[PDB]
Structures are given as C-alpha cells and as structure tokens.
Amino acid sequence: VTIVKEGWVQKRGEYIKNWRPRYFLLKTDGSFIGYKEKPQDVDLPYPLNNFSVAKCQLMKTERPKPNTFIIRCLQWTTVIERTFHVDTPEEREEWTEAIQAVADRLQRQEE
C-alpha cells in the first residue's frame, strides 16, 4: 500500500458545520486518513479521520466555498457526505482524480 496523494485541506466537521484544517492521505487500498497536523511518523497510527473511498460518488462545487469537493458513500448514514475545500481548482481536481482512480482500481480488483 502506498500514498497516492497527500496534502492540507479544509474539512467540514463531523458534528459541527464549520470548516477545520486537516492533513489527509489517500492510499492505494482506498483508505482516506486525516490528521490535525502533517503527521510526524510517530503520530501516523493515531488519525482523527479514517474512512474508505470505495464506491464513492464525487461532486465539485464553488459555493459556499470555491474549490470544494464532496464525497458520498452509501453506508455513511449519519454524516451523509463529507465536504472539503482547497485553495486552487487544480488542487481540487488532483484530489477528485486521485479518489476516483483509487475507487476504480478497487472495483477492477474484485472483477
């Protein structure tokens, strides 16, 4: 398993509808793991966020924040969707490309 993309994002809270900073890693197994800081090697086993992007749906929007992407998976019945924004459209497209590419590989790995 390797890192496909990593970087800083603003993420809407899991319980409160605010934005907070997160450092996220997307891995080849579909894990999308977030930390409060760019992880020191020591802190890698203790993420704040840990979910799978397998079989996700993705949406890109510009309101309320420019360069937003939204991830939805069927089994996320509390949060419904997880919402992110980054500072440029190019960075946003990198994340949504990377996410879909990981999801597609996981689907071909079953087939």
Side-chain angles (χ1 to χ4, degrees), residues 1-16 18-35 37-39 41-45 47-106 108-109 111:
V1 181
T2 48
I3 298 171
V4 176
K5 189 161 166 70
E6 60 181 283
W8 282 103
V9 302
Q10 292 274 93
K11 182 176 173 292
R12 287 220 174 267
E14 293 285 303
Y15 298 90
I16 294 157
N18 55 21
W19 292 107
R20 292 287 186 270
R22 294 286 192 275
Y23 194 90
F24 264 85
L25 276 52
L26 174 69
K27 298 194 193 187
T28 49
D29 63 1
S31 4
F32 197 34
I33 303 170
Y35 301 85
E37 282 164 23
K38 179 169 168 179
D41 294 342
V42 64
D43 295 304
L44 282 175
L48 297 170
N49 305 99
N50 193 352
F51 56 91
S52 179
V53 300
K55 305 185 187 170
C56 71
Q57 302 207 67
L58 295 169
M59 296 202 278
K60 295 180 284 193
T61 61
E62 309 308 320
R63 293 293 165 85
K65 295 281 190 301
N67 312 313
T68 294
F69 59 103
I70 305 163
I71 317 176
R72 282 170 99 147
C73 296
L74 179 73
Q75 74 278 12
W76 300 349
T77 59
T78 312
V79 307
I80 310 102
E81 70 194 14
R82 293 180 163 109
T83 307
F84 301 83
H85 82 260
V86 291
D87 195 53
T88 69
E90 291 90 359
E91 187 73 356
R92 189 225 346 245
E93 195 65 23
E94 293 199 8
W95 279 114
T96 57
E97 285 161 10
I99 294 166
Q100 187 63 254
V102 170
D104 292 346
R105 279 174 187 278
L106 295 176
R108 308 307 180 284
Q109 279 170 24
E111 284 167 27

